[PDB]
Design a protein around this ligand. Sequence first.
Ligand SMILES: [Zn+2]
Ligand SMILES: [Zn+2]
Ligand SMILES: [Zn+2]
Ligand SMILES: [Zn+2]
Lengths: 185, 184, 184
Amino acid sequence: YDTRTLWTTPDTSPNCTIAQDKDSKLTLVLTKCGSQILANVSLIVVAGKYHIINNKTNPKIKSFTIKLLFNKNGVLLDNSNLGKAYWNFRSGNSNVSTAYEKAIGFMPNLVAYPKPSNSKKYARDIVYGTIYLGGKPDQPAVIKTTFNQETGCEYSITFNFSWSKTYENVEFETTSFTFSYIAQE
Amino acid sequence: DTRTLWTTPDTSPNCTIAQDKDSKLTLVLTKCGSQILANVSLIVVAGKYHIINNKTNPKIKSFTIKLLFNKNGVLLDNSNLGKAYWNFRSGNSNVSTAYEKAIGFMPNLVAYPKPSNSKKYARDIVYGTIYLGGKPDQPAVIKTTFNQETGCEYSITFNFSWSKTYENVEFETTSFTFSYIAQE
Amino acid sequence: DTRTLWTTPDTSPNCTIAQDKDSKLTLVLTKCGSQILANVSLIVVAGKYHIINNKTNPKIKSFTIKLLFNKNGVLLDNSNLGKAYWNFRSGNSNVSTAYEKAIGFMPNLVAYPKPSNSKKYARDIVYGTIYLGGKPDQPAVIKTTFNQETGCEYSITFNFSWSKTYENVEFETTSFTFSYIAQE
Ligand SMILES: [Zn+2]
Ligand SMILES: [Zn+2]
Ligand SMILES: [Zn+2]
Ligand SMILES: [Zn+2]
């Protein structure tokens, strides 16, 4: 039982719903380094609207969003794009055998990254990165990660993927990106 | 938490770029053994660098925030960052008294030597890009350099610069993560 | 220090790109449980890649540094990095005896499988950019790939490439941090 890592497992079995049921594998590893969470992410789309991008055929298909919504205990909510079944603490290359009840130490800090309010909204709750479709260096897509900006939850981590190039028949499967964020406790 | 040095995560100004307390530098240094994991963002609230207009002022293109440390890793008062809230973490605040030693958080002097007559290698620099107002077409380059200031034993300096001609853009940024080799 | 594998942070050449010991690769791998936090830079000190001039040599645009490991995470001698120079950290140096096991520092084989007839995914790559001589208009792309080499159980490879036509630019770089999923 690895109590310092929450993850999706590193397999390639679809676990995520962007446009249709289980059309993608989000590989996400959150590793607790005390007051910071070290995060590693990639995405493989296997089917549906976002599997093969062709902006000559479909000029308006330019972005999509994957949302992780959490309750007061850091438990993933079922309206998240990521499925609950394989999001858990690590055991080897798999998960602990039972669903976790508490993971507050992995949640994004609410003082650093407040929910929307009357107070001025600051950009520090965002981290940008670039990943590469098919591993090709001339095929960038931007990954925008935002903390605690969704309603209907206590905490949230959202991944927005977008691209500016007019890609023709480019499969949406990405290289990996690492970032960190300030932990709630 | 003897393991995270930070500015606290509030938004109360703690930093002086062009005028007293014109900014909040949010900096979190977390010790992962031989490496420090660092997370940084900046909010400018007043003064010269608060609202950028490069049509009226085309030469306003960069500024520098310096953290200078003594032999014990204690922040020196001529740093741009204020001493009052730079300390080890306790909850969402700081431990109750100022720290005495943080050498384990300092940038490694063999990896990143102080200025001298010797060849200056670029490995003491890490570049990154952050975004003003969270807008993806509003980049600014954050250049971080280790141990290149004089009048101190260690230093971390952040140079912010931009090439776009911004028009009335508020200088408050997204976050960037990097790491560096620890002194011990 | 059983939590960091490194090259030491000195400037002594330890790597062979085009000719014997023509470079210092500074690589620090720090184990943060399930992830390895990695920090890398390169200084080329002699030979073909020391001073880039693409007017004189228009096709000199990339090179690769390979780390090949066996089943125990031990570095194999066909690697570009020399074995004498790679070990667990002790102070600013290395332990005096060669390590026997470092499987916990190897790239995860399920996350990053060896080449096969199965579909090849891009997640075994991480891109970054570093800067020659620390100048922001002198980028070179560092492409890091996990477990794609033959003749080993695990691998980490660094491919450096550039598109600009550099004229008399010394190949010594700023630093880049990334992470990867650990084997155990
Ligand atoms: Zn496909
Ligand atoms: Zn303002
Ligand atoms: Zn105008
Ligand atoms: Zn760590």
